[PDB]
Design a protein around this ligand. Structure first.
Ligand SMILES: *C(=N)N[C@H]1CCc2ccc(-c3ncnc4[nH]cc(-c5ccccc5)c34)cc21
Length: 276
């Protein structure tokens, strides 16, 4: 079942557009009667790009967690086939359901994302793009981490990596060491996780989003302006009505030095205690 024939993948619509890729909603319909299952299909639109896409497929196929989007297979590598979660990403879900979801529910999502991240860390996988737009909703009480387009495996003898060119992602989720020196690690994923906790507790309201709020708080360019703000110790403010303990955890995720941030394994029990 891990080999999907191209002729049987029926295009429905666009789910997203990446760096040099796209994700489409397709129906895998071998019977041709519209009764087949819906799937999310990623494809490249370059020899390095092809190598990186094959790397992504190999990473996702080797991840088995209730908190990581499921790999289904490949089509010939021409396309990466994943499960489709019709509730879509957490960012939009929170905006739609804000008046229904309480602090307990946000802590449950936080705990699930943390468990997914502890698991990725155990596989020596740096995600590099953790954000509420990349977290999917399986059900009202179950979320999963998605978007492995920038994920990288750490070699056995090195706990970080350096990128030659600065990143192309919206800058507001990057750890200071990534902004300054293009260094990524499981500890920079912890920094981004703190921003995801911020997103959850603001219900992804656009008016106090990481972009809107950092830009408001901010000749010198935006990247350098953000790095200056962060280096001064300025941070995103506690979301409206945020539990104090939750804001304290965000601040720990945003410790200036990566070695001072808590690990996902240390955050996990703290989030579970707050949820209980
Ligand atoms: C929120 N609006 N999230 C969007 C932004 C981009 C994008 C792409 C794909 C999905 C998506 N939705 C449902 N089911 C999915 N299964 C896998 C993916 C996926 C694949 C690659 C990167 C991210 C997400 C799914 C949602 C959104």
């Amino acid at each position: 079942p891990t080999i999907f024939e191209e002729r049987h993948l029926k295009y429905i619509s666009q789910l997203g557009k990446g760096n040099f890729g796209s994700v489409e909603l397709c129906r895998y319909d071998p019977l041709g009667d519209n009764t087949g299952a819906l799937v999310a299909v990623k494809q490249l639109q370059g020899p390095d790009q092809q190598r990186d896409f094959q790397r992504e497929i190999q990473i996702l196929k080797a991840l088995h967690s209730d908190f990581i989007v499921k790999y289904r297979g490949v089509s010939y590598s021409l396309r990466l086939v994943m499960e489709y979660l019709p509730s879509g990403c957490l960012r939009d879900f929170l905006q739609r359901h804000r008046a229904r979801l309480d602090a307990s529910r946000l802590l449950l999502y936080s705990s699930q994302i943390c468990k997914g991240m502890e698991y990725l860390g155990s596989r020596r996988c740096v995600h590099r793009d953790l954000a509420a737009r990349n977290i999917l909703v399986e059900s009202e009480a179950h979320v999963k981490i998605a978007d492995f387009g920038l994920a990288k495996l750490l070699p056995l003898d090195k706990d970080y990596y350096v990128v030659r060119e600065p990143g192309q992602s919206p800058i507001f989720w990057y750890a200071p060491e990534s902004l300054s020196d293009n260094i990524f690690s499981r500890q920079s994923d912890v920094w981004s996780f703190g921003v995801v906790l911020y997103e959850l507790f603001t219900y992804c309201d656009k008016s106090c989003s990481p972009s809107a709020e950092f830009l408001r708080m901010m000749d010198v360019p935006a990247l350098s302006r953000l790095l200056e703000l962060l280096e001064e110790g300025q941070r995103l403010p506690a979301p409206p009505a945020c539990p104090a303990e939750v804001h304290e955890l965000m601040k720990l995720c945003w410790a200036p030095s990566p070695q001072d941030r808590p690990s996902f394994s240390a955050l996990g029990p703290q989030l579970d205690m707050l949820w209980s």
